[PDB]
Amino acid sequence: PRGIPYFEKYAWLFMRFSGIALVFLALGHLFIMLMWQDGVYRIDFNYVAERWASPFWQIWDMALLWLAMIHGANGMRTIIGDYARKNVTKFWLNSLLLLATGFTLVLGSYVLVTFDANIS
Amino acid sequence: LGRPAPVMEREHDRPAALDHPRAPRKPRGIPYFEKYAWLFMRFSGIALVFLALGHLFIMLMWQDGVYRIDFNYVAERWASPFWQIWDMALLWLAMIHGANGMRTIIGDYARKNVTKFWLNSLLLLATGFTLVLGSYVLVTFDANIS
Amino acid sequence: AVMVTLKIARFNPENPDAAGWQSFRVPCLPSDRLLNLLHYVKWYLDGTLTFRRSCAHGVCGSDAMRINGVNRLACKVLMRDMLPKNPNKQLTITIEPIRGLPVEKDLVVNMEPFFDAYRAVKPFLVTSGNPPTKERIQSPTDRARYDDTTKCILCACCTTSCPVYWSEGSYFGPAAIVNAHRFIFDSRDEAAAERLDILNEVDGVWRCRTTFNCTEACPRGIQVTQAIQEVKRALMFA
Amino acid sequence: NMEPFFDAYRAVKPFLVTSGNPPTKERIQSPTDRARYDDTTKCILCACCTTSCPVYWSEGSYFGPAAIVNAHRFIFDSRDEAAAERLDILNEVDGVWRCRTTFNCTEACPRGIQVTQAIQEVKRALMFA
Amino acid sequence: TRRRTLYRGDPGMWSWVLHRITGATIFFFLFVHVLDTALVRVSPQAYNEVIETYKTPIVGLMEIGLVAAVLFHALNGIRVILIDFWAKGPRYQRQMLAVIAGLFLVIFIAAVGVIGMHMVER
Amino acid sequence: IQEHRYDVVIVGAGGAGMRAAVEAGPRARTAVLTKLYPTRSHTGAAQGGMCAALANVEEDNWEWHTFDTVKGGDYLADQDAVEIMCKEAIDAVLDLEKMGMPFNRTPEGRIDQRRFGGHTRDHGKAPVRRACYAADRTGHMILQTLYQNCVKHDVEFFNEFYALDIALTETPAGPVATGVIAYELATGDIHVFHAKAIVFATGGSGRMYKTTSNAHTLTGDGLGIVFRKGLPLEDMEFHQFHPTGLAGLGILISEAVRGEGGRLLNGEGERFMERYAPTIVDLAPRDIVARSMVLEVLEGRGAGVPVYPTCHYVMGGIPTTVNGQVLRDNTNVIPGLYAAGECACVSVHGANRLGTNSLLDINVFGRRAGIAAAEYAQNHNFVDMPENPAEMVVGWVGDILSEHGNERVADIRGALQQSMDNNAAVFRTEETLKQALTDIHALKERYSRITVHDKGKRYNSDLLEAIELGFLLELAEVTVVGALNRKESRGGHAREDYPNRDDTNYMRHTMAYKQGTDLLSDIRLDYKPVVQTRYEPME
Ligand SMILES: Cc1cc2nc3c(=O)[nH]c(=O)nc-3n(C[C@H](O)[C@H](O)[C@H](O)COP(=O)(O)OP(=O)(O)OC[C@H]3O[C@@H](n4cnc5c(N)ncnc54)[C@H](O)[C@@H]3O)c2cc1C
Ligand SMILES: CCCCCCCCCCCCCCCC(=O)OC[C@H](COP(=O)(O)O)OC(=O)CCCCCCCCCCCCCCC
Ligand code: HEM
Ligand code: HEM
Ligand code: HEM
Ligand code: HEM
Ligand code: SF4
Ligand code: SF4
Ligand code: F3S
Ligand code: F3S
Ligand code: FES
C-alpha cells in the first residue's frame, strides 16, 4: 500500500497495449518519412501542409503523439524509480518528467488542432 | 473403494484457493470505482433523456424526417454552437454510458477470466475508436470541404 | 379427492445419471398443501423421492423448491382454490429443485454455498468490550429501524431467484444483504463501517439489477430489495 | 549476510494459512491440484536467483525471484485460505510488476525451477483475477 | 448437462431483460451511426450516397424499431433511477411500470403515426 | 467408517445444543452433530415469550416465579432445580440480550415485558407481566442469536449427521461414555466421534401422536439411544396437551386466546371454562383447559374456528442433575455424559409445564451442561475404545436394508400414531392402556419385517425413516407402561379410573429400565424421590 492501488498493473498493461499500437504507428511514420519518395529530402512546409489536409494523417499523428508520450513517460518513470537513491531526488525528478511530458503534449496537441495551411 | 476427490481448479490462470469456502471475501478492484460507475449511469441517464430524445425528435419527426437529411442539412446544423455542443455531449455521454453497461454485461456473461479480459479489451478499444472518430469529426468540420 | 398429477424432476446422483421428469397420480383433498402430496408420493408410490422438511407450521425454511416456475416453499402451496375446479379437467403441478445451488438429489440441493455467502458478511453483533451487565439500552424507535429484516428464516427462496445470482461472477445474493442490513442498521453495533466496506465491492451490492424477484419470492414478506436499496443509500451518502 | 534475503522470504507469508479446526485426517487434495504448484516446491533457498536480478541490484526494495517462487507455491495450493492476501502483497509497487523479464534467475537456479515462468504465472493470475 | 427452464418471475424481471436488450441494441447502432457520420469529413457526395441508401422502406421499419428501443430504454431507466434515489421507490415499482407502459403506448403510436405519414408522402 | 477425535461432542444444535456449544466452544475442542441445519430446529417454532423476573415495567422477585413454577408443576418438580432455574433465569435473559438479541423495548428502552398465562403477583394475587419477547417470533430470534454466536466463535458443525448410537466402555468402576456413532446422510458413511464428554440436546418426542404440534423430525432419539444402552428414562407418562390445536390437523394457536378475549364456545353458543374453573375464566392451566375441552366434546356438547388438544411437550426424559450429568441410578452418575433441553429431565417442570419456562430451561441448563462438559474434558483424558464400536450400527443398517419384507413403514407408523392418540391421550383408562399395549406389541412384531425401497447410499431418507420408527415404538411402550403404572391424576397425566391426586403413594418420579436388547423386551420400573425445600402440597 505505497501508492494508488492497482496502478502498477494498469501501467504494465498500458505499456503492452501501447506497444502493440505503436508498432504500426511509429514504424509506418518512419517508413513514410524516410524511405518512400526522397526521404527527408522532400520534406518541407508544403509537404506537411498537404499531409495534414487529410483526416487519416491528422488522426495518425495525434494518436502517435499521445501514445508515444505516455509510453515514454511511463518508461522513464520506471527508470527513475530504479536509479534514484534519495526520496527527494525521486520526487523532483518525477515532477520534472511530468512537467516536460505535459508541456510536450500541450504543444503538440495545440499545433495539430490549430494548424492552418494558409498562414502567409 | 472410495469417491474420487473433486478438482478445485477452474482454469489454469485461476488459483483455486481464491474460491476456497472458508476464504475471506475481500474487494477485488479499485476501491469506490463501482460506486461511481453506478452513480454515473444514473446521472448520465438523466442527461441522456433530454439529449437522446431531443436528437431523435428533431431528426425523425420535425419537418420531413430523414427525407430532408443530407450534407447541407448537417452543415447548417453544425454552424451553431448549440447543436455542436449538443452533439458532443451526446457522443461522450452515450458512449461512456453504453460502454459501462456493456462492461456489466460482459462481466456477468463471460464464464472464464481470460474471456472477460479480452472482451473488456475489445470493448475499450471499440469505445475509444468511436470516441476519437466522433470527436475528430465534430471538432475539425468545415462546410467548405469541396 | 381430485387426483392431481405431479411432474417431478428426478435425479439419482449415483445409480443412473440419466433421468428427467416423472408423473405421479395422487389424490388431493382441498385442505391439503403440496407437502402432503409429496408425502403421499414418498410413502406409498415412490420412496426414492428425497426432499427436506422439518416443521409442522412454525416456519424453518427447509423445503424451498421451484413449483410451477416460482420458488414457493412447498409446505405453503395451499392446494385449495383450483381454477380447473371450474372446468372439470386434468391438472398438473411441476416440481423441481431451486436453481443456482448444486443438486444433490431430486429436490435436495447443496446449501453450503448459500451459508458460506451468509457468514461472510460478519452476521453477528460486534461491540466495544465493557458489557454493561444491564441490558444495553436502545430506543423503541431504534428498535424499529432494523426490524423487518429480523424475519429471515434463511431458506434461499430469494437468492435462488436472482438472475444476477444465476449469472457468472460471485454475487453475495439478496439474503446475505438482508442479514447484513440487520446489523448495519443496529444501534448497539460497532462494525457498520466494516460491513459496509464488505458490501462495497464489485461482487457486492452494486450488482443488483433492481429485479424484484427476491421480494416476490420471500415467504416472510421482507421487502428484500428495499433492504438492498437502503444499503446502497447508506453507502453513497457517506 | 543472508538476513535481507530471508526477511524478504518471510514477508510473503510463506506458510499455510487455514481455518482453525483441522480435520484430524489430512484434508483432501486431488492429484490434479497437487501437480499444479509442483516445480516450485524444489526451492532450496540458495539466493542464486535473487542475487542475479538487475532489478534487485537497483533501488527500491524488490521482493525477488525467490520470494515470488515461494509465494507461487502457496498461491497455487488448493488447501490455502490466503491466496488473495498473498496476491495483494505481490500487487504493490515493489512486487511482481518490477520484473523486467530478464531470465537471469532462470539461468542461475541450480534446481532448474523456471523462476521467470513462475513469475509470469503470478502476473497472469493478477491480470485475469 | 443443461436444462431449459423458464423461471416465470416478477414483471420487473422482464423489464430488466428488455432494458438490457434495448441498451445493447442502441450501443451497436451507435457504433454504426458514428462511422457513417464520420463520412462527412471526406466529401458531400459520399455522405449523400450512404444516407440516400438509409432512406428505404426496410430502413424505415428499422428506424421505427430503433425509436421503440430508445423510448423503452429511456422510460424504464427513469423508473430505475427513481427506484434508486426516491426513498419510496421500491414500494411504487410495478405502478411506475404501468405508468411507463401507458406512456410508451401513447408516445410510440404518435411517433409511428408521424413517421408513417412521412414515409407515405414519398 | 471414519474416525474423529474431539474433546466435547454435542448431539443436537437447537436451543440447548447451541447454547452449550457457545459455552464449551472456547474452552475445549468441541463438535456439534445435527440431523438438520442448526436453524431448522424446533426451537424456532416458539412464539411465546421467555419469562424472567427482571422487574422493568412492574415489581417482582424470583421467589414468586419459583412458587408459581412449583405450583404449576403440580408438586412433582424439584425445588432445588426450580430455585436454580429462576435465579439464573434473570442473567440468562440478560446474556441473550447482550449477545445481540432484538428484544422489544420499553418507552425508556431497556426491555419490554408482557403478561402471560398462569404467572401470579405473589402466591396467587394478580398478573405480574414477566414474559420478555422479541416479536410474534421469540424462539426464532433466540435460535438466530445462538447461531450467529456459534458462527462468531467458529464452532465446527456436522450438519445432517444422524447420531445413531453411543459407546459405553465398561471400566471396572462402572461404565463411561467414550464415543458417538453417527450416520452421515449425504454419503452413507458411518462416523465414530471419540470424545471425553458428550452432551445430548436432541429435543423432545411428540411424533408418536397423530395430532401433535411438533416437527416431523421430533421422533425422540436421544431418549431412545439412552434407553437402549440400558440407562433409565424418567417420568415419561407426563405429556402436555396444549388445548388450542386446529381441531382438524394439529397446528398451535398459542397467540390469540391468550392475548385477547378469545372465548372457547362448545357446540351451542356456550362457554364452559367459567363453570369448570372459576377465579379465572379460561386462562387456567393448560392441562385443566384440555381436560375440560375433551370432557365436553366427549359428553356430547361439542360441535361437528375449531380447536382440539394437541400433544405439545414431554415433561420426562433423561434423568440428570442440576449440572447436567446423566444418572444411571437414583444416585450414581455416568462419567462424561451430559444432557440439556427437552430431552433432559432435571424435573424443573414436574408434572405440568408452565408456559415460557422451556426457553428458560434450555438457556440455563444448556449453559450449565456446556461448562460442566468443558471442565470434565479439560480435566480428564481419553479412556479407551471397544472392539470396532460401529459393529452394531453397521450390522443394523445392513440388515434393515438387505431384504424385502411385506410391510409398509408408513402403515406401521400411522397405525401406531392412531392407536396412541386414541388410547394414551388426554384421558386414559386401564382398558384403553391395555389395548394400546397389545397394539404396540403387534406393531413391534410387524416392524420386524419392513421394506426400505431405496437401497441406495447417497441420500437415503427411507432408511432413516424406518430407523426413527424404531425409536417411536420404544418410546411409545415406555409411555404406556408408565401411564399404566401411575394410578392417580397429576398434571398432564389424567386417568378416569382414579381421578384424584394421591400425594401419599405416587409423589415420586417413575424410572424405567430396558431389560433385553431387541425391540420386544421388558420394562422394569423403579421410583425416585422428589426433593422438597419449602413448598408443600395443597389442592
Ligand atoms: C410449536 C411449538 C411451539 C412452542 N412454543 C413455545 C413457547 O412459546 N415457549 C416455550 O418456552 N416453549 C415452547 N415450545 C417448546 C420449546 O421450544 C422446547 O422446550 C425447546 O424448543 C426444546 O428445544 P431443544 O433445544 O431441547 O431441542 P430442539 O430445538 O427441539 O431440537 C433438537 C435439536 O437436536 C438435533 N437432533 C435431534 N435428534 C437428533 C439425532 N437423533 N441425531 C442428531 N441430532 C439430533 C436437531 O438437529 C435439533 O435441532 C414450543 C414447542 C413447539 C413444538
Ligand atoms: C484507442 C483507439 C484509438 C484509435 C486511433 C488509431 C487511428 C490510426 C489511424 C486510423 C485513421 C482512421 C481515420 C479514417 C480517415 C480516412 O481513412 O479517410 C481519409 C481518406 C484519405 O486517405 P489517404 O489520403 O491516406 O488515401 O479519404 C478517402 O478518400 C477515403 C475513401 C473512403 C474511406 C471511408 C472511411 C470512412 C470511415 C470508415 C473507417 C474504417 C474503419 C472500419 C472499422 C470497422
Ligand atoms: C528521421 C526520423 C523522423 C522524421 C524525419 C520525422 C519527421 C516528422 C515530420 C515531417 C512530422 C510532421 C509532418 C507530418 O506528420 O506529416 C513529424 C511529426 C511528428 N513525428 Fe516525426 N519524424 C521522425 C521520427 C519520428 C519518431 C521516431 C517519432 C516517435 C517515436 C515521431 C513522432 C512524431 C510525432 C508525434 C509527430 C507529431 C508532431 C506534432 O503533433 O506536433 N517522429 N515528424
Ligand atoms: C515513441 C516510441 C517509444 C518510446 C518513446 C518508448 C519508450 C520506452 C521506454 C523509455 C521504455 C522503458 C524501458 C524500460 O523500462 O526498460 C519502454 C518500454 C517498453 N516499450 Fe517502448 N518506446 C517506444 C516504442 C515502443 C514500441 C514501438 C514498442 C512495440 C512493441 C514498444 C514496446 C515496449 C514495451 C513492451 C515496453 C515495456 C518493457 C518492459 O516493461 O520491460 N515500445 N518504452
Ligand atoms: C433514426 C434515428 C437517427 C437518425 C436519422 C440520426 C441521424 C443522425 C444525424 C443526422 C447526425 C449528425 C447531424 C447533426 O448532428 O445535425 C447524427 C449524429 C449523431 N447521432 Fe444520430 N441519428 C439517429 C439516432 C441516434 C441515436 C439513437 C443516438 C444515440 C443513442 C444518436 C447519437 C448521435 C451522435 C452522438 C451523433 C454525433 C456524431 C458525431 O459526433 O460524429 N443518434 N445521427
Ligand atoms: C436515453 C436515456 C437513457 C436512460 C434514462 C438510461 C438509463 C439507464 C440506466 C439507469 C441504466 C442502469 C440500469 C441498471 O443498472 O439496471 C442503464 C443501463 C444501460 N444503458 Fe442506458 N440509459 C439511456 C440511454 C442509453 C444509451 C443512449 C445507451 C447506448 C448508447 C445505453 C446503453 C445502456 C446499456 C448497454 C446499459 C446496460 C443494461 C444493463 O446492464 O442492464 N443507454 N441505462
Ligand atoms: S429473505 Fe425472505 S426469502 Fe430470502 S431467505 Fe430470508 S426469508 Fe427466505
Ligand atoms: S535459485 Fe532456484 S533454488 Fe536457489 S533460490 Fe532462486 S529459486 Fe530457490
Ligand atoms: S432478485 Fe436479484 S438483482 Fe436485485 S432486487 Fe432482488 S436482488
Ligand atoms: S532475474 Fe530479475 S527481473 Fe525478472 S525474470 Fe528473473 S526476475
Ligand atoms: S417445512 Fe418448515 S417451512 Fe416448509
Q: How far is D28 from chain F (nearest CA, A)?
A: 14
Selection from A60, A64, A73, A81 nearest residue A15 by Cα: A73
Return left, alpha or beta for E57; rule: phi > 0 is left, psi -120 to 50 is alpha, else beta: alpha
Cell of residue C178, nine digits: 438482508
Cell of residue F518, nine digits: 431387541
Q: Whose CA is nearest to atom 18 of ligand 6?
A: B101
Q: Compute the distance between CA of residue D48 and CA of residue F204 in angstroms, rounded to an integer.
A: 69
Q: What is the residue-wise DSSP string for E4-43?
A: -------HHHHHHHHHHHHHHHHHHHHHHHHHHHHGGGT-
Beta strand pairing call for C66-67 and C70-71: antiparallel
**Ligand 6 centre from B96 Cα, in Å?**
10
Burial (0-12, 13-18, 19+ Cβ within 10 Å), A110? exposed
Helices A87-114 and A55-83: angle between axes, nearest 10 degrees: 170
CATH number at residue A44: 1.20.1300.10
Around ligand 11, the residues with Cβ closer than 6 Å are: C 53-55, 59-63, 73, 75
The fold of C111-238 is Fumarate Reductase Iron-sulfur Protein; Chain B, domain 2 (1.10.1060)
CB atoms within 10 A of CB F218: 25
CB D62 within 8 A of CB D98: yes
Selection from F192, F247, F490, F201 nearest residue F340 by Cα: F201
- Tell me which DSSP letter residue F320 carries: B
Cell of residue F72, nine digits: 404449576
Q: Is residue B104 in some structural domain?
A: yes
CB atoms within 10 A of CB A1: 9
CB F464 within 8 A of CB F509: no
Could C229 and E9 be called an inter-chain contact, meaning their C-beta atoms sit closer than 8 Å?
A: no
Q: Compute the distance between CA of residue F103 and CA of residue F101 in angstroms, rounded to an integer.
A: 6
Radius of gyration of chain F (CA): 22
Q: Which residues pair with F200 in a beta bridge?
A: F11, F339
In words, the CATH class of domain D2-129 is: mainly alpha
Distances (CA, A) of D88 to C223, D41, F224: 37, 22, 54
3-state SS, residue F169: strand
Could B69 and E51 be called an inter-chain contact, meaning their C-beta atoms sit closer than 8 Å?
A: yes
Q: Is residue A120 in some structural domain?
A: no
One-letter amino acid at F295 equals: L
Q: Is residue B1 in some structural domain?
A: no
Q: Whose CA is nearest to atom 26 of ligand 6?
A: B94
SS (H, E, C) C77-143: CCCCCCHHHCCCCCCEEEEECCCCCCEEECCEECCHHHHHHHCCCCCCCCCCCCCCCCCCCCCCCCH
First vs last Cα of chain F: how many Å apart? Answer: 57
Could A6 and D60 be called an inter-chain contact, meaning their C-beta atoms sit closer than 8 Å?
A: no
CB F11 within 8 A of CB F201: yes
Could D24 and F154 be called an inter-chain contact, meaning their C-beta atoms sit closer than 8 Å?
A: no
Selection from C26, C10, C28 nearest residue C18 by Cα: C10
Q: Compute the distance between CA of residue D79 and CA of residue D37 in angstroms, rounded to an integer.
A: 11
Which residues, including other chains, have CB under 8 Å from residue C168's CB and lie 6 or more apart? B107, B108, B109, B110, B111
Residue of D33, D73, D80, D128 for testing the chain B interface, max B β-carbons within 10 Å: D128
Element (H, E) at F184: strand F174-184
β strands within chain C, DSSP E: 4-9, 21-26, 66-67, 70-71, 92-96, 103-105, 108-109
Q: What is the residue-wise DSSP string for F77-146?
A: S-HHHHHHHHHHHHHHHHHHHHHT--PPPPSSSS--EE--TT--SSSSSS----EE-SSS-HHHHHHHHH
Q: Compute the distance between CA of residue C203 and CA of residue C199 in angstroms, rounded to an integer.
A: 8
Q: Compute the distance between CA of residue B71 and CA of residue F518 in angstroms, rounded to an integer.
A: 100
Report how far Cα A108 is from the mean position of its chain's Cα atoms: 9
Selection from F153, F530, F533 nearest residue F370 by Cα: F153
- Tell me which DSSP letter residue C191 carries: -
The pick from C72, C98, C157 for probing ligand 7's pocket by mutation, whose C-beta has the most ligand atoms within 8 angstroms, reads C157
Torsion of CA F146, F149, F151, F155, to 10 degrees: -80
Report how far Cα F496 is from the mean position of its chain's Cα atoms: 26
SS (H, E, C) D37-102: CCCCCCCCCCCCCHHHCHHHHCCCCCCCHHHHHHHHHHHCCCCCCCHHHHHHHHCCCCCHHHCCCC
Q: How far is C216 from chain E (nearest CA, A)?
A: 7
Selection from E17, E108, E90 nearest residue B56 by Cα: E108
| Cβ–ligand 10 contact at D100 (below 6 Å) | yes
For the question of residue F286 being annotated catalytic, the response is yes
Q: Compute the distance between CA of residue E53 and CA of residue A117 in angstroms, rounded to an integer.
A: 35
The count of C-alpha atoms lying within 13 angstroms of the C-alpha of C195, restricted to the half-sphere facing its C-beta, is: 26
CB F228 within 8 A of CB F221: no
- φ/ψ (deg, to 5) at F63: -70, -35
- Which of E34, E45, E80 lies nearest to residue B133, judging by beta carbons? E34
Sign of the CA dihedral running C166, C169, C175, C177? negative
Chain E residues with CB within 8 Å of chain B CB: 20, 23-24, 26-27, 30-31, 34-35, 37-38, 40-45, 47-48, 51, 54-55, 60, 63, 67, 70-71, 74, 77-78, 80-81, 84-85, 111, 114-115, 118, 122
Beta strand pairing call for F197-200 and F333-339: parallel
Helices F62-72 and F79-99: angle between axes, nearest 10 degrees: 120
The count of C-alpha atoms lying within 13 angstroms of the C-alpha of F431, restricted to the half-sphere facing its C-beta, is: 2
Spell out the domain ranges in chain E.
Answer: 11-120
Selection from F136, E5, F143 nearest residue C71 by Cα: E5
Q: Is residue A84 in some structural domain?
A: yes
Q: Compute the distance between CA of residue F34 and CA of residue F44 in angstroms, rounded to an integer.
A: 15
CB F351 within 8 A of CB F281: no
Could A2 and D58 be called an inter-chain contact, meaning their C-beta atoms sit closer than 8 Å?
A: no
Element (H, E) at F163: strand F161-171
Interior CA angle at C115 toward C109 and C116, to 5°? Answer: 115
**Ligand 2 centre from D127 Cα, in Å?**
32
The ligand 2 atom nearest the CA atom of A21: 6
Q: Whose CA is nearest to atom 4 of ligand 5?
A: B59
Selection from E58, E26, E106 nearest residue B56 by Cα: E26
Tell me which chain A residues have a C-beta less than 8 angstroms from the C-beta of B139: 113
Given 3-state DSSP classes, what are the helix, strand and coil percentages for chain C, each rounded to the nearest 5?
Answer: 30, 10, 60
SS (H, E, C) F466-535: HHHHHHHHHHHHHHHHHHHHCCCCECCECECCCCCCCCCCCCEEEEEEECCCCCCCCEEEEEEECCCCCC
Could B28 and C236 be called an inter-chain contact, meaning their C-beta atoms sit closer than 8 Å?
A: no
Q: Compute the distance between CA of residue B101 and CA of residue E26 in angstroms, rounded to an integer.
A: 11
Cell of residue A72, nine digits: 515514454
First vs last Cα of chain A: how many Å apart? Answer: 56
Q: Provide the greatest CA pair distance for chain D.
A: 47
Interior CA angle at C206 toward C201 and C210, to 5°? Answer: 160
Spell out the domain ranges in chain D.
Answer: 2-129
Q: Give the domain range for residue A3.
A: 1-114
3-state SS, residue D120: helix
Please pick, among F19, F130, F207, F286, the residue that the annotation labels catalytic.
F286
Q: Which residue has the cell 431483460?
A: E17
| Cβ–ligand 2 contact at E42 (below 6 Å) | yes
Selection from F514, F394, F513, F518 nearest residue F445 by Cα: F518
β strands within F354-459, DSSP E: none
Q: Compute the distance between CA of residue F338 and CA of residue F326 in angstroms, rounded to an integer.
A: 5
One-letter amino acid at F58 equals: E
Cell of residue D129, nine digits: 483475477
First vs last Cα of chain E: how many Å apart? Answer: 55
Which residues, including other chains, have CB under 8 Å from residue A41's CB and lie 6 or more apart? none
CATH of segment(s) C1-110: 3.10.20.30
Selection from F212, F215, F154, F164 nearest residue F189 by Cα: F164
Distances (CA, A) of F234 to E119, F223, F316: 93, 10, 5
Q: Which residues pair with A112 in a beta bridge?
A: none
Beta strand pairing call for F50-51 and F333-339: unpaired
Q: Compute the distance between CA of residue D14 and CA of residue D85 in angstroms, rounded to an integer.
A: 12
**Ligand 1 centre from F219 Cα, in Å?**
11
Spatial strand order of the sheet with F8-11 comes to: F156-159, F30-34, F8-11, F197-200, F333-339, F325-327
Q: Is residue B59 in some structural domain?
A: yes
- φ/ψ (deg, to 5) at F437: -65, -45
Q: Compute the distance between CA of residue F95 and CA of residue C136 in angstroms, rounded to an integer.
A: 10
**Closest-CA residue of chain C to E94:** C212
Could A9 and D127 be called an inter-chain contact, meaning their C-beta atoms sit closer than 8 Å?
A: yes
Q: Which residues pair with F131 in a beta bridge?
A: F51, F114
CB atoms within 10 A of CB D75: 28
3-state SS, residue F177: strand
Q: Compute the distance between CA of residue D98 and CA of residue F478 in angstroms, rounded to an integer.
A: 77
CB F470 within 8 A of CB F224: yes
Q: Which residue has the cell 458478511?
A: C121
**Any contact of F with A, at least 3 CB pairs below 8 A?**
no
* Ligand positioned closest to the Cα atom of A78: 4
Q: Compute the distance between CA of residue A100 and CA of residue A81 in angstroms, rounded to an integer.
A: 17
Burial (0-12, 13-18, 19+ Cβ within 10 Å), C145? middle
CB D96 within 8 A of CB D123: yes
**Ligand 11 centre from C112 Cα, in Å?**
19
The fold of E11-120 is 3 helical TM bundles of succinate and fumarate reductases (1.20.1300)
Burial (0-12, 13-18, 19+ Cβ within 10 Å), C169? middle
**Ligand 3 centre from A29 Cα, in Å?**
7
Spatial strand order of the sheet with F174-184 comes to: F2-5, F190-194, F174-184, F161-171
Tell me which chain D residues have a C-beta less than 8 angstroms from the C-beta of F154: 19-21
Cell of residue D88, nine digits: 495483494
Selection from F417, F51, F199, F47 nearest residue C55 by Cα: F47
The ligand 6 atom nearest the CA atom of B38: 15
First vs last Cα of chain D: how many Å apart? Answer: 37
Return left, alpha or beta for C133; rule: phi > 0 is left, psi -120 to 50 is alpha, else beta: left
- Tallying the residues shown for chain E, one arrives at 122
Torsion of CA F42, F43, F49, F53, to 10 degrees: 140
One-letter amino acid at F252 equals: L
Element (H, E) at F25: helix F15-27
Cell of residue C131, nine digits: 458489557
**Any contact of E with D, at least 3 CB pairs below 8 A?**
no
* Ligand positioned closest to the Cα atom of B145: 2
For chain A, what is the domain count? 1
Could B31 and A113 be called an inter-chain contact, meaning their C-beta atoms sit closer than 8 Å?
A: no
The count of C-alpha atoms lying within 13 angstroms of the C-alpha of D3, restricted to the half-sphere facing its C-beta, is: 1
* Ligand positioned closest to the Cα atom of F250: 1
| Cβ–ligand 9 contact at C227 (below 6 Å) | no
CB atoms within 10 A of CB F464: 18
Q: Which residues of F405-434 are buried (b: 16+ CB within 10 A; e: fewer)?
A: eeebbbebbebbbebbbebbbbbbeeebbe
**Any contact of C with E, at least 3 CB pairs below 8 A?**
yes
Q: Is D43 on the interface with B (CB under 8 A)?
A: no
3-state SS, residue C42: helix
Which residues, including other chains, have CB under 8 Å from residue F126's CB and lie 6 or more apart? F120
Q: What is the residue-wise DSSP string for F331-354?
A: S-EEEEEEE-TTSEE-SSSTTSPP
Burial (0-12, 13-18, 19+ Cβ within 10 Å), F53? buried
The pick from E14, E18, E19 for probing ligand 6's pocket by mutation, whose C-beta has the most ligand atoms within 8 angstroms, reads E19
Selection from B67, B49, B47, B71 nearest residue B59 by Cα: B67
CB C235 within 8 A of CB C200: yes
Q: Compute the distance between CA of residue F77 and CA of residue F60 in angstroms, rounded to an integer.
A: 22
- Which of B105, B126, B146 lies nearest to residue E43, judging by beta carbons? B146
Could E89 and C209 be called an inter-chain contact, meaning their C-beta atoms sit closer than 8 Å?
A: no
Which residues, including other chains, have CB under 8 Å from residue A68's CB and lie 6 or more apart? A22, A25, A26
The ligand 9 atom nearest the CA atom of C177: 7
**Ligand 4 centre from A74 Cα, in Å?**
9
Helices B113-139 and E11-38: angle between axes, nearest 10 degrees: 50
Q: Which residue has the cell 470396532?
A: F388
CB F492 within 8 A of CB F430: no
The ligand 6 atom nearest the CA atom of B49: 2
CB A5 within 8 A of CB B32: no
Burial (0-12, 13-18, 19+ Cβ within 10 Å), C22? middle
First vs last Cα of chain C: how many Å apart? Answer: 60
What method did the depositors use to determine the structure? Answer: cryo-EM
Q: Compute the distance between CA of residue C208 and CA of residue C118 in angstroms, rounded to an integer.
A: 17
Q: Compute the distance between CA of residue A94 and CA of residue A107 in angstroms, rounded to an integer.
A: 20
Q: Is residue B8 in some structural domain?
A: no
Which residues, including other chains, have CB under 8 Å from residue F357's CB and lie 6 or more apart? F51, F69, F85, F348, F349
Radius of gyration of chain C (CA): 21
Could F102 and C153 be called an inter-chain contact, meaning their C-beta atoms sit closer than 8 Å?
A: no
**Ligand 3 centre from A64 Cα, in Å?**
9
